[PDB]
Amino acid sequence: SALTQPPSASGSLGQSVTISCTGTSSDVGGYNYVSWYQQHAGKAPKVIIYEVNKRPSGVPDRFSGSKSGNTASLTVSGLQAEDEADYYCSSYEGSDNFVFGTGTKVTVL
Ligand SMILES: O=C(O)c1cc(/N=N/c2ccc(S(=O)(=O)Nc3ccccn3)cc2)ccc1O
């Protein structure tokens, strides 16, 4: 029981990176309650997106979410050096329960 994410992804500075988060019709595909977290090495996780494509305050406009079917995604557009980090998704999966993805390490070329 984990959501599927690519282990790693790279992009050039100023370009975009997209990270997918694939589950099933019982979680990612069944609800609009996908969240994304950014974690720099040895630091606490930052909430970047909730409810598929809502941003907390302080998250730049260049981070966005989308979802189609059983796959949600996070795009980091206008890639900056500080965007190098591990990124995790999560979903609601029914009955007051949540499930996390396995994480993607994003590097800048
Ligand atoms: O500042 C904020 O906006 C802020 C927002 C935060 N959002 N946290 C989350 C984390 C996950 C979700 S979610 O995509 O799972 N959505 C939901 C929605 C309703 C019930 C359960 N889950 C929803 C909100 C958490 C802390 C904060 O400070």
Author numbering: 2 to 110
Paper text:
Of these 13 molecules from DrugBank, only sulfasalazine showed an inhibitory effect on formation of amyloid fibrils. Crystals of the complex belong to space group P21212 with two symmetry-related ligands bound per Mcg dimer, and thus one ligand bound per VL in the asymmetric unit. The crystal structure shows that each of the sulfasalazine ligands occupy all three A-B-C-sites simultaneously; each ligand binds to the A and B-sites on one of the VLs composing the dimer, while C-site binding is on the symmetry-related VL. This contrasts with methylene blue, which is bound only to the A-site. The crystal structure of Mcg with sulfasalazine explains why only one disassociation constant for specific binding was measured. Therefore, the equivalence of the two sulfasalazine ligands in the crystal explains why only one disassociation constant was measured by means of equilibrium dialysis. Scatchard plots for sulfasalazine show that the two specific binding sites on Mcg are identical with the same disassociation constant and that this specific ligand binding is followed by non-specific binding. In the case of sulfasalazine, to confirm binding specifically to soluble dimers, the analytical ultracentrifugation experiments identified dimers as the only quaternary state of the ligand-bound complex. The ligand concentration that effectively inhibited amyloid formation in these assays was 500 μM for methylene blue and 250 μM for sulfasalazine.
